[PDB]
Enzyme design. Structure first.
Site, mmCIF file in Angstrom:
data_model
loop_
_atom_site.group_PDB
_atom_site.id
_atom_site.type_symbol
_atom_site.label_atom_id
_atom_site.label_comp_id
_atom_site.label_asym_id
_atom_site.label_seq_id
_atom_site.Cartn_x
_atom_site.Cartn_y
_atom_site.Cartn_z
ATOM 1 C CG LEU A 1 -1.869 -1.182 1.383
ATOM 2 C CD1 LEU A 1 -2.511 -1.222 2.781
ATOM 3 C CD2 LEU A 1 -2.938 -1.179 0.315
ATOM 4 N N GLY A 2 2.097 1.173 0.413
ATOM 5 C CA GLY A 2 2.974 2.323 0.556
ATOM 6 C C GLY A 2 4.369 1.816 0.871
ATOM 7 N N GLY B 1 8.694 3.290 1.813
ATOM 8 C CA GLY B 1 9.579 4.362 2.203
ATOM 9 C C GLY B 1 10.999 3.846 2.231
ATOM 10 C CE1 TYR C 1 -6.313 -1.311 2.888
ATOM 11 C CE2 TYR C 1 -8.272 -2.714 2.699
ATOM 12 C CZ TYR C 1 -7.324 -1.896 2.120
ATOM 13 O OH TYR C 1 -7.382 -1.637 0.770
ATOM 14 C CB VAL C 2 -8.356 3.136 6.533
ATOM 15 C CG1 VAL C 2 -9.418 4.144 6.093
ATOM 16 C CG2 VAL C 2 -8.332 3.092 8.045
ATOM 17 C CG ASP D 1 5.091 13.030 8.159
ATOM 18 O OD1 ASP D 1 5.494 13.991 7.444
ATOM 19 O OD2 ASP D 1 5.114 11.839 7.768
ATOM 20 C CE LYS E 1 3.747 12.531 4.466
ATOM 21 N NZ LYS E 1 4.997 12.189 3.734
ATOM 22 C CG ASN F 1 1.146 10.684 6.734
ATOM 23 O OD1 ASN F 1 1.374 9.777 5.934
ATOM 24 N ND2 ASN F 1 2.108 11.314 7.400
ATOM 25 C CG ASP G 1 3.948 7.719 8.567
ATOM 26 O OD1 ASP G 1 4.698 7.421 9.510
ATOM 27 O OD2 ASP G 1 4.390 7.957 7.426
ATOM 28 C CB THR H 1 6.556 16.112 4.427
ATOM 29 O OG1 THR H 1 6.441 14.720 4.778
ATOM 30 C CG2 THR H 1 6.205 16.353 2.954
HETATM 31 C C1 A03 Z 1 10.192 8.112 7.151
HETATM 32 C C2 A03 Z 1 10.294 6.883 6.220
HETATM 33 N N1 A03 Z 1 9.441 5.797 6.683
HETATM 34 C C3 A03 Z 1 9.553 4.552 6.195
HETATM 35 O O1 A03 Z 1 10.348 4.218 5.321
HETATM 36 C C4 A03 Z 1 8.598 3.519 6.803
HETATM 37 C C5 A03 Z 1 7.436 3.183 5.862
HETATM 38 C C6 A03 Z 1 6.577 4.430 5.649
HETATM 39 C C7 A03 Z 1 5.519 4.274 4.560
HETATM 40 C C8 A03 Z 1 4.749 5.599 4.499
HETATM 41 N N2 A03 Z 1 3.508 5.430 3.726
HETATM 42 C C9 A03 Z 1 2.361 5.033 4.282
HETATM 43 O O2 A03 Z 1 2.220 4.792 5.486
HETATM 44 C C10 A03 Z 1 1.174 4.864 3.334
HETATM 45 O O3 A03 Z 1 0.608 3.536 3.531
HETATM 46 C C11 A03 Z 1 -0.848 3.642 3.567
HETATM 47 N N3 A03 Z 1 -1.388 3.274 4.908
HETATM 48 C C12 A03 Z 1 -0.803 3.503 6.085
HETATM 49 N N4 A03 Z 1 -1.570 3.029 7.061
HETATM 50 C C13 A03 Z 1 -2.650 2.487 6.510
HETATM 51 C C14 A03 Z 1 -3.783 1.861 7.033
HETATM 52 N N5 A03 Z 1 -3.924 1.688 8.356
HETATM 53 N N6 A03 Z 1 -4.716 1.421 6.174
HETATM 54 C C15 A03 Z 1 -4.585 1.597 4.862
HETATM 55 N N7 A03 Z 1 -3.528 2.201 4.331
HETATM 56 C C16 A03 Z 1 -2.540 2.648 5.133
HETATM 57 C C17 A03 Z 1 -1.178 5.067 3.162
HETATM 58 O O4 A03 Z 1 -1.288 5.057 1.742
HETATM 59 C C18 A03 Z 1 0.060 5.838 3.665
HETATM 60 O O5 A03 Z 1 0.262 7.023 2.934
HETATM 61 C C19 A03 Z 1 9.947 7.270 4.771
HETATM 62 O O6 A03 Z 1 10.830 7.340 3.917
HETATM 63 N N8 A03 Z 1 8.671 7.568 4.542
HETATM 64 C C20 A03 Z 1 8.200 7.993 3.218
HETATM 65 C C21 A03 Z 1 8.205 9.514 3.168
HETATM 66 C C22 A03 Z 1 9.182 10.077 2.132
HETATM 67 C C23 A03 Z 1 8.553 10.043 0.739
HETATM 68 C C24 A03 Z 1 8.945 11.234 -0.114
HETATM 69 C C25 A03 Z 1 7.725 11.739 -0.907
HETATM 70 O O7 A03 Z 1 7.254 12.889 -0.691
HETATM 71 N N9 A03 Z 1 7.238 10.848 -1.801
HETATM 72 C C26 A03 Z 1 6.070 11.124 -2.681
HETATM 73 C C27 A03 Z 1 6.005 10.032 -3.754
HETATM 74 C C28 A03 Z 1 5.422 8.738 -3.178
HETATM 75 C C29 A03 Z 1 3.893 8.853 -3.142
HETATM 76 N N10 A03 Z 1 3.396 8.331 -1.869
HETATM 77 C C30 A03 Z 1 2.143 8.519 -1.443
HETATM 78 N N11 A03 Z 1 1.272 9.211 -2.174
HETATM 79 N N12 A03 Z 1 1.791 7.959 -0.275
HETATM 80 C C31 A03 Z 1 6.169 12.494 -3.356
HETATM 81 O O8 A03 Z 1 7.259 12.904 -3.736
HETATM 82 N N13 A03 Z 1 5.022 13.174 -3.485
HETATM 83 C C32 A03 Z 1 4.940 14.520 -4.079
HETATM 84 C C33 A03 Z 1 4.235 15.488 -3.122
HETATM 85 C C34 A03 Z 1 4.791 15.467 -1.687
HETATM 86 C C35 A03 Z 1 4.276 16.737 -0.977
HETATM 87 N N14 A03 Z 1 2.929 16.459 -0.417
HETATM 88 C C36 A03 Z 1 1.928 17.322 -0.610
HETATM 89 N N15 A03 Z 1 0.738 17.075 -0.078
HETATM 90 N N16 A03 Z 1 2.104 18.430 -1.327
HETATM 91 C C37 A03 Z 1 4.150 14.518 -5.401
HETATM 92 N N17 A03 Z 1 4.279 15.611 -6.128
HETATM 93 O O9 A03 Z 1 3.436 13.570 -5.723
#
Ligand code: A03
Length: 341
Positions: A40-41, A43, A113-114, A157, A159, A162, A175, A192
């Protein structure tokens, strides 16, 4: 009177939190008790997987962290915070941690799970939310930060990524990887980029006001469809953040703009949420004049939308990620580092 009952609610909530904070739960479980369904995600040190618990058939979202990567990236304390906090909190807009465990290689946090997916995906798809819709989500975050901050927890965090949308159309915050229990000030550079308060960027001792700054970014992003501070390079984003300058789309109401100028206040000592009147400056703001705070808490307000539900285990609301092996070593890795887990 309206305030004394808030005060009552909070004191009680603290009692409960501390009972769990002081003696964390521990399980009990193995990876081989689960069938992996979908990533689902991801990092840098972990991932989140939809899994099915074989004995019961229950679906869960399982956060899996690689212990060696945690240690290498110096995230030990943060993973410990995340587990300890998540197991102790209880609030309608916080994702439920069902249980945690660890094995030779990994740490596991098994959440409810959501299936509705991230607010981020829904926001990006629709473009932007109306002010009533943004306000409905914002009000839930305000109440959640009021809850968290009274427990001396900083979330760090916020955003749309999350914020999960449940089957009632309400938020479930997930998260807690950067959450910390701390009275007064902390120093870690985390979060972030688009959501960082100026005082985090300026490498100052910062407090809970960073979460209120982040609320300003979120409201702005929900209502505009893009964040207030963006640029190609992170450094360019940081220069904008600390400048004291923010432009609003022309459709933002004057009440919204006034609220945002007070949340996106670069001087933390003048930021709404962080003045003598605390969260009530926010809750009493004209932009929230139509918000029934108790009806929100009770989930009695008709949600803007309810995500499409294709039965238990449906993942249609999530993006596809590359499916990678989950390894469990013959030998225990990083035993002492994670003994409190
Ligand atoms: C701290 C370290 N942690 C780790 O490595 C541990 C594992 C963390 C997984 C996080 N995801 C999650 O947790 C996701 O899993 C689902 N999830 C979680 N719990 C859940 C649940 N109970 N039920 C269902 N789903 C769940 C949700 O989808 C949730 O977002 C880590 O590296 N954590 C990750 C944070 C750095 C990513 C950089 C970035 O911005 N990446 C995105 C691209 C990836 C797209 N990801 C998602 N959409 N989720 C990116 O560059 N996005 C930019 C915009 C960023 C700015 N955000 C804004 N709102 N403007 C883009 N332009 O797309």
């Amino acid at each position: 009177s309206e305030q004394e009952s808030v005060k009552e609610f909070l004191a009680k909530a603290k009692e409960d939190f501390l009972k769990k904070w002081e003696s964390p739960a521990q399980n009990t479980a193995h990876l081989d008790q689960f069938e992996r369904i979908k990533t689902l995600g991801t990092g840098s040190f972990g991932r989140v997987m939809l899994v099915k618990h074989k004995e019961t058939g229950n679906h869960y979202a399982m956060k899996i962290l690689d212990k060696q990567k945690v240690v290498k990236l110096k995230q030990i304390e943060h993973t410990l915070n995340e587990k300890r906090i998540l197991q102790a909190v209880n609030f309608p807009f916080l994702v439920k941690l069902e249980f945690s465990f660890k094995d030779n290689s990994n740490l596991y946090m098994v959440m409810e799970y959501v299936p509705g997916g991230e607010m981020f995906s829904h926001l990006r798809r629709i473009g932007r939310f109306s002010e009533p819709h943004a306000r409905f989500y914002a009000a839930q975050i305000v109440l959640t930060f009021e809850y968290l901050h009274s427990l001396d927890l900083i979330y760090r965090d916020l955003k749309p990524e999350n914020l999960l949308i449940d089957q009632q159309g309400y938020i479930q915050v997930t998260d807690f990887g950067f959450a910390k229990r701390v009275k007064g000030r902390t120093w870690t550079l985390c979060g972030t980029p688009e959501y960082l308060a100026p005082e985090i960027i300026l490498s100052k001792g910062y407090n809970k006001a960073v979460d209120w700054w982040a609320l300003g970014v979120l409201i702005y992003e929900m209502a505009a469809g893009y964040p207030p501070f963006f640029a190609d390079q992170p450094i360019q984003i940081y220069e904008k953040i600390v400048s004291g300058k923010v432009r609003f789309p022309s459709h933002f109401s004057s009440d919204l703009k006034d609220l945002l100028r007070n949340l996106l206040q670069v001087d933390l000592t003048k930021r709404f949420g962080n003045l003598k009147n605390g969260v009530n400056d926010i809750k009493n703001h004209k932009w929230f004049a139509t918000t029934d705070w108790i009806a929100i808490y009770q989930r009695k307000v008709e949600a803007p939308f309810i995500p499409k539900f294709k039965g238990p285990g449906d993942t249609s609301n999530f993006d596809d990620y590359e499916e990678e092996e989950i390894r469990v070593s013959i030998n225990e890795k990083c035993g002492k580092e994670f003994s409190e887990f």
